[PDB]
Amino acid sequence: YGYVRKVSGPVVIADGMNGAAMYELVRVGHDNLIGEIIRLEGDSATIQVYEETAGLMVNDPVLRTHKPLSVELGPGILGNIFDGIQRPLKTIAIRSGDVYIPRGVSVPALDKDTLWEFQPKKIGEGDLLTGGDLYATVFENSLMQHHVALPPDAMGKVTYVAPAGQYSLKDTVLELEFQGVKKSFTMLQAWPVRTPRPVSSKLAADTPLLTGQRVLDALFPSVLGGTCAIPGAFGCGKTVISQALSKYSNSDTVVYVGCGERGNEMAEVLMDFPQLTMTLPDGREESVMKRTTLVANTSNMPVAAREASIYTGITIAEYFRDMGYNVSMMADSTSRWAEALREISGRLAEMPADSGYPAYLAARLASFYERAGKVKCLGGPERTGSVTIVGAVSPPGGDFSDPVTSATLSIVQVFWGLDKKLAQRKHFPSVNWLISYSKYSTALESFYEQFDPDFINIRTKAREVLQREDDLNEIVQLVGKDALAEGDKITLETAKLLREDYLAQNAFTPYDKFCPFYKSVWMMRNIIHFYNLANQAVITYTLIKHRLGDLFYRLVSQKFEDPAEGEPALVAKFKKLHEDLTAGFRALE
Amino acid sequence: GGDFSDPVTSATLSIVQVFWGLDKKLAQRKHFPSVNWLISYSKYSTALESFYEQFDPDFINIRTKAREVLQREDDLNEIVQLVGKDALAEGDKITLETAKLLREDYLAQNAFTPYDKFCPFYKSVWMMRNIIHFYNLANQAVEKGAGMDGQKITYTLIKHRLGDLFYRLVSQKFEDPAEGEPALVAKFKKLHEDLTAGFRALEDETR
Amino acid sequence: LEVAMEYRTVTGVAGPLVILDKVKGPKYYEIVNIRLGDGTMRRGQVLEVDGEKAVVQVFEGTSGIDNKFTTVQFTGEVLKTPVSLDMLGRIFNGSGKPIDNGPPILPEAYLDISGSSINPSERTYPEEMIQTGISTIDVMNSIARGQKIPLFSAAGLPHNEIAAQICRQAGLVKRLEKDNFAIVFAAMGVNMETAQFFKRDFEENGSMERVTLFLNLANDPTIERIITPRIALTTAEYLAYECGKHVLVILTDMSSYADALREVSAAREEVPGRRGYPGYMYTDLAQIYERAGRIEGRKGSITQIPILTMPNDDITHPTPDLTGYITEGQIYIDRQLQNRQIYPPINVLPSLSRLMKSAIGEGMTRRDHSDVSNQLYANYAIGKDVQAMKAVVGEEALSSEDLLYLEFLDKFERKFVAQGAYDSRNIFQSLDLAWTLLRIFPRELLHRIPGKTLDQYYSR
Amino acid sequence: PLFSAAGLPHNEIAAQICRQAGLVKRGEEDNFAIVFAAMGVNMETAQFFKRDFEENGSMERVTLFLNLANDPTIERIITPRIALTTAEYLAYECGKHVLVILTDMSSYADALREVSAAREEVPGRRGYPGYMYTDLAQIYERAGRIEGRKGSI
Amino acid sequence: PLFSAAGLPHNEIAAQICRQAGLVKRLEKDGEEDNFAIVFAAMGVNMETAQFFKRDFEENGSMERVTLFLNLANDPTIERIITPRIALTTAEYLAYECGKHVLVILTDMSSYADALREVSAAREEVPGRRGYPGYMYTDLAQIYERAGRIEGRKGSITQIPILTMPNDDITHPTPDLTGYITEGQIYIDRQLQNRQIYPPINVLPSLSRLMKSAIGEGMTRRDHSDVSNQLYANYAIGKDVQAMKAVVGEEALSSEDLLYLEFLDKFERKFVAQGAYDSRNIFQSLDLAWTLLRIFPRELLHRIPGKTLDQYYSR
Amino acid sequence: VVPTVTMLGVMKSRLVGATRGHALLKKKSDALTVQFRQILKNIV
Amino acid sequence: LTLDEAIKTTNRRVNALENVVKPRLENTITYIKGELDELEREDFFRLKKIQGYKKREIERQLASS
């Protein structure tokens, strides 16, 4: 019930919708075009339709949905591929057979006829349960067990519990009554993208995001449930860091979110993920897709879907965190999302602000980024998850002055700063140590000292060495290495060794594909301790340089060792090398 | 006074085939025809190939050489604005001399006197050929390097001991068209012969 | 089976628009034919509809229309262009009506323009190279079947000559690796004189069985200039994914297309967007471009080389800066090189392809492609720097290597880049020329070249 | 005010000033009561403020008006109004001197810009509302000493 | 139109022109009809400026000749959009239908553009550049194109509408349109005023389309065009030389550079400057210009032809 | 200076030219410094 | 002596000239986009408001009849 009255491009006016609500999604026309309500002036409505509105007919029916832009969560959310508006691309392609996306597809987000193995918890048929209680878990696939949380805003004494067995989402797995009225819940939960997910308490982040790369792990650490920023426009560093996060990061899940980038780039990345495979610490070999969800909205996709992809991804990440899993979101191109928002604002004729973006761009970006953090779960049993966002930025020409870049730098705690200059100089990590920073180091210092009380001092010494590296750089630039003192020469040599041996990774090489934090800490110790032990001896720089050739080779090889030997063997080898270097530095003095 | 971003200007340049872009800077310097030769263009240069070939089968090459000379001079004007003509070599110096001669002789025209009231195509092409031939011969001479100096020494040699040809070149604009083509053509052919005598007589004693 | 009603209720004419009075159940983007009082015929498109109202944008202008003698006969359609396999080898007007003195197309299908987007799951990374015959493109800025590479130009620069050369010389590199190559050629808002150039080039090309020249003049109605690239993209999509044929598309002066979209948007009383261009221009250009790509389920592909004019000879203009993000490359035409009388004035050093690595490989093209490309890049840069230094150091103090780089720069500018307008060059002989230029330096001097390649080719 | 770009320790300076605030003493009942407005602060900054204020032991004389970035943008405009009204009541109508603190005034400016752009009002420089001077006056132009009363803001 | 900015003495030089304007033909020119019968129309003028003009006209003995239509700033704004039209109608009647040469001084045309802006805004019309009405060009054409000699009558109308750029620019719509329409542009530069030269007229931006018609051997020295075109070129090239020497140092300059700098100094000091009550005969002005030119050698005088050089390079 | 699109283009061109000239002057200064170091070594 | 002169010129260009020009470019960009572009939208927005008011008044007058 409801018919269109005026169709001016994307904007659509439909009469007979007195009961419509603002921002309620609606189905327009026989083709089931999907659009969101904007203005409810009079008894009429106003809808902007995402897909092309060409060919609409006056008095074509309009069908309400009684729900805002929402995502159907539950089993089967992992692995698949979804559009910006939560449209399963893979199943759409299989059903329609052809390649083109049909104008008005109506495939449900998750297949409601597929069977998943279900088994309840030890709860009783007449017990009491509340919102967020974990009443069952499902083996969606191997090694990615999926907990079934009773939806929030739903509570009451238990009435029926489905016994363990094979079931589908259409089955009524749960039914309960709060008052005399009883409600039955399936395995599918719908939640609006704009509304965040209910939380019990925002904890303080207390565990680093071990990305497997030494430069990010030690120099500029990032904590679970913490924002991150990447100036990714070239050098494939964004692809490299995304692959590292998918394969080696501590997160139990990853939710890539791609909006408004080049279509072939998304093709390349979405073909790269299935090829990516990660080995289990127990020796098992798995596929990253078994723990990966992908929301990719190319430029050809409607602008509104491009804007909504980010919120869809963050809501998916929050739902994953609802069962205490550590999940990491990855916004492919926030600049593209901002451009989509700008286009939408221009469609709405909103008053332009700085550089043309709407005045709420900073506010909306902050609202999105504020959802990341380590959070106590809702409902029992007690557990705690985390959501960390590693959303990248694409400043125009590298000038960190655009409002998107400025707002992101103002909100994001940790900025890693990939540099194209290092990429030109053949640097695999490509992380510019001169601009990167980790504002969460003060909070992470508790764990840093618990693991090793000397590690934080080593990090401070390394930061001082990096600061003096540029000083020695202009010193050599203006007068040369001749004017450098023995201590200055030792400091410069140690800085160069740190840059070319530990601060840089080798990625492609099997020995340096993954850098454990243990190996990173031992390498940092074997570098800094040797640097000091050589420093206080000032001894002729040439003499120590000649007599430390074996020590220099050991320091260089302190990163060539493969992780095959494991932590106990590599730690012992690094300790022996450090002791030998200390003996050589002290005895020869 | 307004850049090409003007909507009328952009619309015209999106359609117009030949742009005689006059520059206000040339108007300040009182260069009266005032066409800026860096920003102007003519997309008809390809269709006129037959007419240029039949009139003079070597005009295209001399025109391209003149364009290259003008572009090179405009390019190193910025460098001179920083360092100065001290580092200018023989080739650069001769290129700038030829560019200045082309700018003040060829590209100017009074139009208030019979010298420049109406320049027929033959007179213009003869001026262009004379200037380009002088440039090419001078470049070849300074590249010869005879007399153990050559180079800018040979440039000064041709600008001092051979400067009468230079003055006749810079005054060639005054060939009165009323004298008729058979007379002006003979005069320019004689000037070309005298120019060929130079840079060969100058090379006789090896500078 | 329904004969569309021919309403005669014109109740307002203004500019290009005519507002009908009491149309019963219109369609938003319907297409309507107008029979004026004098009997002449005009075709118009339907813009925003309302209660019984329908604003119609009329082609060919609106002169002579009167509110009591003009009939507006609807159709109930959305401009399904006629598409067939025999559409190749013929020149078409802006709206699709053939102008090659031939018959109208007998269609194998009526595909609606502005086709539905490709499922991103079904895309596949582009592979293999597409030979263009221009050395600067196929050596240092290689092109792969499936890219969307702009050709940024400016007013006065010979963009159309490069367009014609690409249209003629385009071919498949895989000739030596061991004919399904079609070139949908679209030209939007060309000058009145370049129309003769395009007609001549496509009337004596020698490979007419490949090209299809959709042509839209400047004085043709604007809405034709909007529809022309969409018609071309639809025909290319059909010939690629519905006929299994590799397809290349050249869009000429999409800045004119942007201006046409600006003209249409203003007529609908919409507020102008940033810098005058409508805000939806990003969506429009993304819609035009993203139709390319390689489909896993089909053996065909679409590769775009859209030619864009950058006003004021700068990239800050909204159209080039906007298309920079969508695409993955930039092949600039430099004004100074045109002044230097190098016929292809492509500034190779500024130019780059964001995914030129896919075209370079072993199976496709030749093994030494990446090495020679990088060596040429680096040596050109060095030569430019050395020329700049010689402008200020007097050139007497330059070392031997400085003179080597100077002569290499001169040779590269005057023998490699300056390809003739008709000197078709296969990639193999283009690389042979590159090696000819490279071999001047000592074998040990080419630092960027990896081992086992110098020994193979440096011996000539 | 304190002029300090993003990322600078101005929050730490504000916390130190508030915790160490006191008269010249050259009295405790009329001593400095601090009204601490917080317009558009991050959650981590909010927890830091709460913990730092609870640690100094001066909770007995400090009021926090916290407004996170999650809260609605219009609700941020009334936070300084409420803070200054409570300060006015404490100082003029009760006597004790009040040391009003508002963090991230640029967040308040952004809230004003968003609200004005919503209603499509006449824009000043940088798209800000043309009455921003008057609003910043109605916020700032309350500090001072009134003759008949011993308070001070 | 005299282009000026706020604070520059455009009113003073306008009064000087009013007091000094006269015929030149063979230096021969009662002349009551030759008397220019100045019609002065002031729009949006500070009362001090009106008093100044009144006193100057009274003192110069022209009180029986000049005519003043005043629209002071405190006076209603709308009357500023009628005052110049009234002045031009009065000038037309005094010249064409009465045979008197007439001179008109419209003052502060920007104060007329402001009235146009106010009227257009009050009507909710579509704005143009900087919010000015889209038809400001038509109004400015209507207000300027009402001057010029007419074949059938012995009269004439010559107007000097002074203009005030808002932020001392030219891209502003009002000075831009005035430059488009009017056949001239006299530029008064802030740089010259900062250097304390009473006539700050920058001779390089200046332009007169009908300059080639007024001059000539029949009414001026034969070298006038040459002299002007050479001084302009030397001043422009010398300014470029000074700009170069500002960065390369006074030492790096060549002999020609030093000659150009000396020419600039003596041109801006001895030539441009003139007394606030002292005129200069056109032949005296040409003599001064020739003294300025003769700094350079005969070779450097490229624009001047040898025929005029022989009669003037020595004098 | 008065702000305009042409003025913006002129300022951008001036900045680009200044950067190029600065690079050229830095190269010249480096060469002169190398020559001076060689002369000092020869004198020593 | 030559190196001192060249170094002085280079340092002056790096410090004074470029850092003088770049603020000028930023101010020119801000003056155009920050003001003229904003005003153009505001002018057109007010015009559209005037048109909407006229249409609403016409509709109300017709309904009152």
Swiss-Prot record, chain A:
Keywords in alphabetical order, please: ATP-binding, Hydrogen ion transport, Ion transport, Nucleotide-binding, Translocase, Transport
A GO-annotated cellular component: proton-transporting V-type ATPase, V1 domain
Q: What is its EC number?
A: 7.1.2.2
Q: Which SUPFAM superfamilies match?
A: C-terminal domain of alpha and beta subunits of F1 ATP synthase (SSF47917), N-terminal domain of alpha and beta subunits of F1 ATP synthase (SSF50615), P-loop containing nucleoside triphosphate hydrolases (SSF52540)
Top enzyme class, one word, equals: translocase
- Residue ranges crossing the lipid bilayer per the database entry: none
Reaction equation(s) it catalyzes: ATP + H2O + 4 H(+)(in) = ADP + phosphate + 5 H(+)(out)
GO biological process: any one?
A: ATP metabolic process
List of residues binding ATP: 232-239
Q: One MF term in GO for this entry?
A: proton-transporting ATPase activity, rotational mechanism
Give the InterPro entries listed for this entry. ATP-synt_VA_C, ATP-synth_a_Xtn, ATP_synth_asu-like_sf, ATPase_a/bsu_AS, ATPase_F1/V1/A1_a/bsu_N, ATPase_F1/V1/A1_a/bsu_N_sf, ATPase_F1/V1/A1_a/bsu_nucl-bd, ATPase_F1/V1_b/a_C
Q: PROSITE patterns in the record, alphabetically?
A: ATPASE_ALPHA_BETA
Highest taxon listed in the record's lineage: Eukaryota
CDD domains in alphabetical order: ATP-synt_V_A-type_alpha_C (cd18111), ATP-synt_V_A-type_alpha_N (cd18119), V_A-ATPase_A (cd01134)
Record's function text: Catalytic subunit of the peripheral V1 complex of vacuolar ATPase. V-ATPase vacuolar ATPase is responsible for acidifying a variety of intracellular compartments in eukaryotic cells.
Please give the subunit comment from the record: V-ATPase is a heteromultimeric enzyme composed of a peripheral catalytic V1 complex (main components: subunits A, B, C, D, E, and F) attached to an integral membrane V0 proton pore complex (main component: the proteolipid protein).
Family classification:
Belongs to the ATPase alpha/beta chains family.
Q: What is this protein called?
A: V-type proton ATPase catalytic subunit A
Give the species. Citrus unshiu
